[PDB]
RNA sequence: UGGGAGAGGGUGGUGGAAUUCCCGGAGUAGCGGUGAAAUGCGCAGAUACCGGGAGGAACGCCGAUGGCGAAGGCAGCCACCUGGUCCACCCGUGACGCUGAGGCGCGAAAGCGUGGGGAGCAAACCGGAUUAGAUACCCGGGUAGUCCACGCCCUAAACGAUGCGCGCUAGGUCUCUGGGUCUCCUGGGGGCCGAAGCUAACGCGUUAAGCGCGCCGCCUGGGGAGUACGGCCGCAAGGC
């Protein structure tokens, strides 16, 4: 609708969902999808297939905006990360590159109990 | 395995306390801002301990990075 | 007194005047604090490993000096008061610990 | 800190004879220097207890030596003191 | 006297990563969470993404099987103030030593008092699930507290559950830190395996749990009981 051509694809993988966001060359989102955006409602969202689908939903909706080439950026380490990547590559969009940018503190905040017991 | 070559053998006579020689210091950081382990640096307990001090100093100055993005996956 | 090494990084966008007006107060404060300058270097512009003060670069300064330790903190506290001054790192000098040599 | 010269001063000022470095007076004078400095260090930094243990050892080592003097040469003792102005 | 290594301690500065919140941008219907879910959050536009700001707390990689400290304990970086300790020279004193009832000081966490500060986390607590019930485990919230300053409290599986000092009794191997004529000798630490020997075994073995001397502390079947009484200490909780 605005014609952007080339941009960024952000994969936010986690153990509960995969949410993809495509943005213009400088971070502003164009479209987005996720296990919830598509059918899946609960546990299924995490699954890699859902990731695959969301990834495709994202690209498809992005090509409408005239997208063609993307720069992928992966954040997260969920059960479905690597699938969204293979999804975008076969989506039609050209994967110019892949980069893992998962945030990691240099030891800041006391984690939730669920994420402790970690020496 | 850890056998690509040790960064020490790959260098020449250099001052481990020179926190400005980013030219060489940089060769001690991984494909990320991360300080390489002795298995890779080829340095010694004492040498390695001084490097750290130096690197961190360069990082504060802006000459060296604290972290970088992995390019693949 | 002791031998130190003042490091100063400042705004990389200064006209010859502003650059001299800063080096002015830099040189000044030093004298005001017993900073006997043994040497100096000015590599100037360099590409920071990360943006400092939103700027992808910085103009570097370096002075090997000798001064009253009890004032090394105040000295550096002073150098920092400037806006054009973005970094102040003072360090006790050391014999170069060679290696792989 | 205590500079070599600062130190060499007391060593002369107290040595029983030239080249005397290990006399009870010399040792008591050196300990007295360190003690006083540390005591000053601790008037400020009252929470620096790890350093205070060092003070405790010094003061102990001192009374011990002084004790030896008093027992060996009651005079040198009174003199060493009066001069240093210890105890009180 | 000359040197050395060190997260040893205190003070003041300062750095970047992340979380939360606030501001702007862009974007749209879900996010989150679980074994599965729901509570919860989101069209007053959340989640995901970019930019700016605020603030508190902690310090990734290097980190070890490492280092330092009497113990408790101690990890960005820089400066100052300061403790201990190891080595070389063989220079000075001339047994000045060891231990140590009582005393005095230090003493993790929680907890207390006064005043600050609160990002994140989280006793209580409020809810959602699970369950036969579930005053729990799992999930969404959340106050004290966790942080700082001053005082208090004085406990622990405060552990090597091994009191301190000294002398003596094979060696091999790895390691940290000095010195050397830098195969490798030497000194001080940290580990492993082991002569002799010791031990109820397990194991210990020059870092003894071996062979000895010195001094302190402590035990004397289990339960009642670390309770009662008394005394001392503490604001209290409670401690001895
Ligand atoms: K809903
Ligand atoms: K046996
Ligand atoms: K009582
Ligand atoms: Mg889910
Ligand atoms: Mg330290
Ligand atoms: Mg931040
Ligand atoms: Mg906003
Ligand atoms: Mg909420
Ligand atoms: Mg609603
Ligand atoms: Mg609702
Ligand atoms: Mg509406
Ligand atoms: Mg932001
Ligand atoms: Mg706030
Ligand atoms: Mg130790
Ligand atoms: Mg411990
Ligand atoms: Mg020292
Ligand atoms: Mg002699
Ligand atoms: Mg004689
Ligand atoms: Mg004793
Ligand atoms: Mg006695
Ligand atoms: Mg305590
Ligand atoms: Mg506490
Ligand atoms: Mg309180
Ligand atoms: Mg309060
Ligand atoms: Mg919570
Ligand atoms: Mg049941
Ligand atoms: Mg129920
Ligand atoms: Mg909870
Ligand atoms: Mg233990
Ligand atoms: Mg050994
Ligand atoms: Mg040894
Ligand atoms: Mg050894
Ligand atoms: Mg045997
Ligand atoms: Mg047995
Ligand atoms: Mg047997
Ligand atoms: Mg053994
Ligand atoms: Mg023995
Ligand atoms: Mg035994
Ligand atoms: Mg004892
Ligand atoms: Mg008893
Ligand atoms: Mg009985
Ligand atoms: Mg009993
Ligand atoms: Mg009790
Ligand atoms: Mg009372
Ligand atoms: Mg009372
Ligand atoms: Mg109790």
mmCIF file of N, CA, C and O in Angstrom, chain C residues 14-82:
data_model
loop_
_atom_site.group_PDB
_atom_site.id
_atom_site.type_symbol
_atom_site.label_atom_id
_atom_site.label_comp_id
_atom_site.label_asym_id
_atom_site.label_seq_id
_atom_site.Cartn_x
_atom_site.Cartn_y
_atom_site.Cartn_z
ATOM 1 N N UNK C 14 33.882 19.514 16.094
ATOM 2 C CA UNK C 14 34.268 20.824 16.588
ATOM 3 C C UNK C 14 35.145 21.564 15.589
ATOM 4 O O UNK C 14 36.086 20.989 15.041
ATOM 5 N N UNK C 15 34.822 22.833 15.343
ATOM 6 C CA UNK C 15 35.607 23.646 14.421
ATOM 7 C C UNK C 15 36.933 23.933 15.113
ATOM 8 O O UNK C 15 37.008 23.920 16.343
ATOM 9 N N UNK C 16 37.975 24.192 14.331
ATOM 10 C CA UNK C 16 39.297 24.445 14.892
ATOM 11 C C UNK C 16 39.285 25.331 16.137
ATOM 12 O O UNK C 16 40.155 25.205 17.005
ATOM 13 N N UNK C 17 38.300 26.218 16.232
ATOM 14 C CA UNK C 17 38.195 27.110 17.381
ATOM 15 C C UNK C 17 37.727 26.355 18.622
ATOM 16 O O UNK C 17 38.426 26.324 19.636
ATOM 17 N N UNK C 18 36.544 25.750 18.536
ATOM 18 C CA UNK C 18 35.979 24.983 19.644
ATOM 19 C C UNK C 18 36.973 23.930 20.133
ATOM 20 O O UNK C 18 37.128 23.723 21.336
ATOM 21 N N UNK C 19 37.640 23.272 19.188
ATOM 22 C CA UNK C 19 38.626 22.243 19.504
ATOM 23 C C UNK C 19 39.785 22.833 20.303
ATOM 24 O O UNK C 19 40.317 22.192 21.207
ATOM 25 N N UNK C 20 40.177 24.057 19.968
ATOM 26 C CA UNK C 20 41.268 24.714 20.674
ATOM 27 C C UNK C 20 40.790 25.290 22.013
ATOM 28 O O UNK C 20 41.563 25.368 22.973
ATOM 29 N N UNK C 21 39.519 25.688 22.072
ATOM 30 C CA UNK C 21 38.947 26.245 23.298
ATOM 31 C C UNK C 21 38.796 25.169 24.362
ATOM 32 O O UNK C 21 38.803 25.461 25.562
ATOM 33 N N UNK C 22 38.629 23.926 23.920
ATOM 34 C CA UNK C 22 38.509 22.818 24.854
ATOM 35 C C UNK C 22 39.919 22.445 25.300
ATOM 36 O O UNK C 22 40.189 22.382 26.501
ATOM 37 N N UNK C 23 40.819 22.223 24.340
ATOM 38 C CA UNK C 23 42.204 21.877 24.664
ATOM 39 C C UNK C 23 42.766 22.957 25.573
ATOM 40 O O UNK C 23 43.692 22.721 26.351
ATOM 41 N N UNK C 24 42.196 24.151 25.455
ATOM 42 C CA UNK C 24 42.598 25.286 26.267
ATOM 43 C C UNK C 24 42.315 24.967 27.732
ATOM 44 O O UNK C 24 43.235 24.874 28.546
ATOM 45 N N UNK C 25 41.039 24.782 28.055
ATOM 46 C CA UNK C 25 40.632 24.480 29.422
ATOM 47 C C UNK C 25 41.235 23.165 29.912
ATOM 48 O O UNK C 25 41.466 22.994 31.113
ATOM 49 N N UNK C 26 41.482 22.239 28.983
ATOM 50 C CA UNK C 26 42.083 20.943 29.311
ATOM 51 C C UNK C 26 43.491 21.230 29.835
ATOM 52 O O UNK C 26 43.849 20.859 30.954
ATOM 53 N N UNK C 27 44.279 21.903 29.003
ATOM 54 C CA UNK C 27 45.644 22.276 29.345
ATOM 55 C C UNK C 27 45.651 23.091 30.625
ATOM 56 O O UNK C 27 46.515 22.916 31.480
ATOM 57 N N UNK C 28 44.678 23.986 30.745
ATOM 58 C CA UNK C 28 44.567 24.843 31.916
ATOM 59 C C UNK C 28 44.360 24.046 33.201
ATOM 60 O O UNK C 28 45.230 24.032 34.077
ATOM 61 N N UNK C 29 43.208 23.388 33.313
ATOM 62 C CA UNK C 29 42.895 22.589 34.493
ATOM 63 C C UNK C 29 44.105 21.766 34.916
ATOM 64 O O UNK C 29 44.436 21.713 36.098
ATOM 65 N N UNK C 30 44.758 21.125 33.948
ATOM 66 C CA UNK C 30 45.945 20.324 34.234
ATOM 67 C C UNK C 30 46.922 21.134 35.081
ATOM 68 O O UNK C 30 47.271 20.742 36.193
ATOM 69 N N UNK C 31 47.363 22.268 34.544
ATOM 70 C CA UNK C 31 48.292 23.135 35.253
ATOM 71 C C UNK C 31 47.757 23.459 36.650
ATOM 72 O O UNK C 31 48.481 23.363 37.640
ATOM 73 N N UNK C 32 46.482 23.828 36.723
ATOM 74 C CA UNK C 32 45.831 24.171 37.989
ATOM 75 C C UNK C 32 45.877 23.041 39.010
ATOM 76 O O UNK C 32 45.672 23.276 40.201
ATOM 77 N N UNK C 33 46.123 21.817 38.546
ATOM 78 C CA UNK C 33 46.169 20.659 39.435
ATOM 79 C C UNK C 33 47.527 19.961 39.538
ATOM 80 O O UNK C 33 47.600 18.800 39.936
ATOM 81 N N UNK C 34 48.596 20.669 39.184
ATOM 82 C CA UNK C 34 49.929 20.091 39.263
ATOM 83 C C UNK C 34 50.257 19.105 38.155
ATOM 84 O O UNK C 34 51.188 18.305 38.271
ATOM 85 N N UNK C 35 49.498 19.165 37.070
ATOM 86 C CA UNK C 35 49.720 18.264 35.951
ATOM 87 C C UNK C 35 50.915 18.669 35.097
ATOM 88 O O UNK C 35 50.789 19.458 34.159
ATOM 89 N N UNK C 36 52.081 18.129 35.427
ATOM 90 C CA UNK C 36 53.284 18.417 34.658
ATOM 91 C C UNK C 36 53.258 17.425 33.481
ATOM 92 O O UNK C 36 53.474 16.224 33.661
ATOM 93 N N UNK C 37 52.976 17.929 32.281
ATOM 94 C CA UNK C 37 52.870 17.081 31.091
ATOM 95 C C UNK C 37 54.172 16.564 30.508
ATOM 96 O O UNK C 37 54.874 17.287 29.819
ATOM 97 N N UNK C 38 54.479 15.300 30.758
ATOM 98 C CA UNK C 38 55.704 14.712 30.236
ATOM 99 C C UNK C 38 55.625 14.515 28.726
ATOM 100 O O UNK C 38 56.605 14.743 28.021
ATOM 101 N N UNK C 39 54.462 14.090 28.233
ATOM 102 C CA UNK C 39 54.274 13.866 26.798
ATOM 103 C C UNK C 39 52.833 14.066 26.330
ATOM 104 O O UNK C 39 51.994 14.574 27.075
ATOM 105 N N UNK C 40 52.554 13.667 25.089
ATOM 106 C CA UNK C 40 51.214 13.815 24.520
ATOM 107 C C UNK C 40 51.037 13.146 23.154
ATOM 108 O O UNK C 40 52.005 12.867 22.439
ATOM 109 N N UNK C 41 49.776 12.896 22.815
ATOM 110 C CA UNK C 41 49.385 12.295 21.548
ATOM 111 C C UNK C 41 47.983 12.784 21.236
ATOM 112 O O UNK C 41 47.208 13.085 22.143
ATOM 113 N N UNK C 42 47.661 12.874 19.950
ATOM 114 C CA UNK C 42 46.350 13.349 19.533
ATOM 115 C C UNK C 42 45.955 12.619 18.256
ATOM 116 O O UNK C 42 46.075 13.160 17.160
ATOM 117 N N UNK C 43 45.496 11.379 18.404
ATOM 118 C CA UNK C 43 45.086 10.569 17.261
ATOM 119 C C UNK C 43 43.775 11.096 16.696
ATOM 120 O O UNK C 43 43.278 10.618 15.672
ATOM 121 N N UNK C 44 43.219 12.084 17.386
ATOM 122 C CA UNK C 44 41.982 12.695 16.953
ATOM 123 C C UNK C 44 40.817 11.771 16.661
ATOM 124 O O UNK C 44 40.440 10.936 17.481
ATOM 125 N N UNK C 45 40.247 11.933 15.473
ATOM 126 C CA UNK C 45 39.098 11.151 15.038
ATOM 127 C C UNK C 45 39.329 9.651 14.921
ATOM 128 O O UNK C 45 40.326 9.208 14.353
ATOM 129 N N UNK C 46 38.386 8.884 15.469
ATOM 130 C CA UNK C 46 38.413 7.422 15.422
ATOM 131 C C UNK C 46 36.986 6.860 15.475
ATOM 132 O O UNK C 46 36.090 7.443 16.109
ATOM 133 N N UNK C 47 36.788 5.725 14.805
ATOM 134 C CA UNK C 47 35.479 5.072 14.739
ATOM 135 C C UNK C 47 35.208 4.237 15.990
ATOM 136 O O UNK C 47 35.737 3.132 16.136
ATOM 137 N N UNK C 48 34.379 4.766 16.887
ATOM 138 C CA UNK C 48 34.034 4.070 18.124
ATOM 139 C C UNK C 48 33.423 2.688 17.866
ATOM 140 O O UNK C 48 32.750 2.476 16.863
ATOM 141 N N UNK C 49 33.668 1.744 18.768
ATOM 142 C CA UNK C 49 33.130 0.394 18.624
ATOM 143 C C UNK C 49 31.632 0.447 18.901
ATOM 144 O O UNK C 49 30.906 -0.526 18.687
ATOM 145 N N UNK C 50 31.181 1.598 19.387
ATOM 146 C CA UNK C 50 29.770 1.823 19.668
ATOM 147 C C UNK C 50 29.572 3.327 19.824
ATOM 148 O O UNK C 50 30.509 4.046 20.168
ATOM 149 N N UNK C 51 28.351 3.828 19.568
ATOM 150 C CA UNK C 51 28.102 5.268 19.698
ATOM 151 C C UNK C 51 28.220 5.786 21.111
ATOM 152 O O UNK C 51 27.632 5.228 22.037
ATOM 153 N N UNK C 52 28.997 6.847 21.277
ATOM 154 C CA UNK C 52 29.139 7.474 22.579
ATOM 155 C C UNK C 52 28.458 8.820 22.392
ATOM 156 O O UNK C 52 28.825 9.584 21.495
ATOM 157 N N UNK C 53 27.449 9.092 23.213
ATOM 158 C CA UNK C 53 26.705 10.348 23.123
ATOM 159 C C UNK C 53 25.997 10.487 21.766
ATOM 160 O O UNK C 53 25.976 11.561 21.166
ATOM 161 N N UNK C 54 25.424 9.385 21.290
ATOM 162 C CA UNK C 54 24.697 9.360 20.022
ATOM 163 C C UNK C 54 25.592 9.521 18.795
ATOM 164 O O UNK C 54 25.138 9.349 17.664
ATOM 165 N N UNK C 55 26.864 9.834 19.018
ATOM 166 C CA UNK C 55 27.800 10.035 17.916
ATOM 167 C C UNK C 55 28.669 8.799 17.653
ATOM 168 O O UNK C 55 29.309 8.277 18.565
ATOM 169 N N UNK C 56 28.706 8.319 16.395
ATOM 170 C CA UNK C 56 29.489 7.142 15.992
ATOM 171 C C UNK C 56 31.000 7.352 15.984
ATOM 172 O O UNK C 56 31.753 6.494 15.501
ATOM 173 N N UNK C 57 31.441 8.490 16.514
ATOM 174 C CA UNK C 57 32.867 8.804 16.570
ATOM 175 C C UNK C 57 33.239 9.677 17.758
ATOM 176 O O UNK C 57 32.371 10.211 18.465
ATOM 177 N N UNK C 58 34.547 9.812 17.964
ATOM 178 C CA UNK C 58 35.063 10.625 19.051
ATOM 179 C C UNK C 58 36.445 11.135 18.694
ATOM 180 O O UNK C 58 37.146 10.534 17.867
ATOM 181 N N UNK C 59 36.837 12.248 19.301
ATOM 182 C CA UNK C 59 38.148 12.842 19.047
ATOM 183 C C UNK C 59 38.980 12.567 20.292
ATOM 184 O O UNK C 59 38.676 13.081 21.374
ATOM 185 N N UNK C 60 40.028 11.763 20.132
ATOM 186 C CA UNK C 60 40.877 11.374 21.255
ATOM 187 C C UNK C 60 42.073 12.252 21.618
ATOM 188 O O UNK C 60 42.694 12.890 20.771
ATOM 189 N N UNK C 61 42.383 12.251 22.911
ATOM 190 C CA UNK C 61 43.498 12.993 23.477
ATOM 191 C C UNK C 61 44.233 12.063 24.442
ATOM 192 O O UNK C 61 43.656 11.093 24.938
ATOM 193 N N UNK C 62 45.503 12.352 24.705
ATOM 194 C CA UNK C 62 46.295 11.523 25.608
ATOM 195 C C UNK C 62 47.474 12.322 26.145
ATOM 196 O O UNK C 62 48.202 12.949 25.381
ATOM 197 N N UNK C 63 47.669 12.291 27.457
ATOM 198 C CA UNK C 63 48.763 13.031 28.065
ATOM 199 C C UNK C 63 49.442 12.227 29.160
ATOM 200 O O UNK C 63 48.810 11.885 30.155
ATOM 201 N N UNK C 64 50.724 11.925 28.989
ATOM 202 C CA UNK C 64 51.458 11.204 30.022
ATOM 203 C C UNK C 64 51.908 12.280 31.010
ATOM 204 O O UNK C 64 52.707 13.146 30.657
ATOM 205 N N UNK C 65 51.403 12.246 32.238
ATOM 206 C CA UNK C 65 51.784 13.278 33.196
ATOM 207 C C UNK C 65 52.254 12.790 34.562
ATOM 208 O O UNK C 65 52.302 11.588 34.833
ATOM 209 N N UNK C 66 52.598 13.762 35.408
ATOM 210 C CA UNK C 66 53.052 13.540 36.780
ATOM 211 C C UNK C 66 52.335 14.573 37.646
ATOM 212 O O UNK C 66 52.399 15.765 37.353
ATOM 213 N N UNK C 67 51.651 14.133 38.700
ATOM 214 C CA UNK C 67 50.929 15.076 39.556
ATOM 215 C C UNK C 67 50.621 14.559 40.959
ATOM 216 O O UNK C 67 50.851 13.391 41.263
ATOM 217 N N UNK C 68 50.116 15.445 41.840
ATOM 218 C CA UNK C 68 49.756 15.110 43.222
ATOM 219 C C UNK C 68 48.555 14.164 43.236
ATOM 220 O O UNK C 68 47.421 14.573 42.982
ATOM 221 N N UNK C 69 48.823 12.900 43.537
ATOM 222 C CA UNK C 69 47.799 11.865 43.565
ATOM 223 C C UNK C 69 46.507 12.296 44.245
ATOM 224 O O UNK C 69 45.417 12.072 43.722
ATOM 225 N N UNK C 70 46.630 12.919 45.408
ATOM 226 C CA UNK C 70 45.463 13.377 46.152
ATOM 227 C C UNK C 70 44.550 14.293 45.326
ATOM 228 O O UNK C 70 43.427 14.607 45.738
ATOM 229 N N UNK C 71 45.025 14.719 44.159
ATOM 230 C CA UNK C 71 44.235 15.600 43.311
ATOM 231 C C UNK C 71 43.832 14.966 41.987
ATOM 232 O O UNK C 71 43.087 15.568 41.214
ATOM 233 N N UNK C 72 44.317 13.751 41.733
ATOM 234 C CA UNK C 72 43.999 13.033 40.496
ATOM 235 C C UNK C 72 42.504 12.852 40.297
ATOM 236 O O UNK C 72 42.015 12.867 39.165
ATOM 237 N N UNK C 73 41.780 12.654 41.393
ATOM 238 C CA UNK C 73 40.346 12.486 41.285
ATOM 239 C C UNK C 73 39.726 13.839 40.981
ATOM 240 O O UNK C 73 38.944 13.957 40.038
ATOM 241 N N UNK C 74 40.087 14.868 41.746
ATOM 242 C CA UNK C 74 39.538 16.199 41.492
ATOM 243 C C UNK C 74 39.856 16.652 40.076
ATOM 244 O O UNK C 74 39.003 17.213 39.396
ATOM 245 N N UNK C 75 41.088 16.412 39.642
ATOM 246 C CA UNK C 75 41.510 16.793 38.300
ATOM 247 C C UNK C 75 40.516 16.220 37.299
ATOM 248 O O UNK C 75 39.894 16.961 36.531
ATOM 249 N N UNK C 76 40.360 14.899 37.325
ATOM 250 C CA UNK C 76 39.446 14.212 36.421
ATOM 251 C C UNK C 76 37.997 14.646 36.628
ATOM 252 O O UNK C 76 37.226 14.710 35.674
ATOM 253 N N UNK C 77 37.622 14.937 37.870
ATOM 254 C CA UNK C 77 36.262 15.387 38.159
ATOM 255 C C UNK C 77 35.998 16.663 37.362
ATOM 256 O O UNK C 77 34.902 16.876 36.831
ATOM 257 N N UNK C 78 37.034 17.500 37.305
ATOM 258 C CA UNK C 78 37.027 18.785 36.610
ATOM 259 C C UNK C 78 36.897 18.594 35.099
ATOM 260 O O UNK C 78 35.971 19.117 34.476
ATOM 261 N N UNK C 79 37.828 17.851 34.515
ATOM 262 C CA UNK C 79 37.799 17.591 33.083
ATOM 263 C C UNK C 79 36.425 17.154 32.588
ATOM 264 O O UNK C 79 36.058 17.428 31.449
ATOM 265 N N UNK C 80 35.670 16.476 33.445
ATOM 266 C CA UNK C 80 34.351 15.974 33.070
ATOM 267 C C UNK C 80 33.246 17.034 33.007
ATOM 268 O O UNK C 80 32.249 16.856 32.299
ATOM 269 N N UNK C 81 33.427 18.133 33.735
ATOM 270 C CA UNK C 81 32.431 19.207 33.780
ATOM 271 C C UNK C 81 32.050 19.761 32.403
ATOM 272 O O UNK C 81 31.003 20.386 32.249
ATOM 273 N N UNK C 82 32.895 19.529 31.406
ATOM 274 C CA UNK C 82 32.629 20.014 30.055
ATOM 275 C C UNK C 82 31.602 19.165 29.310
ATOM 276 O O UNK C 82 31.493 17.950 29.524
#
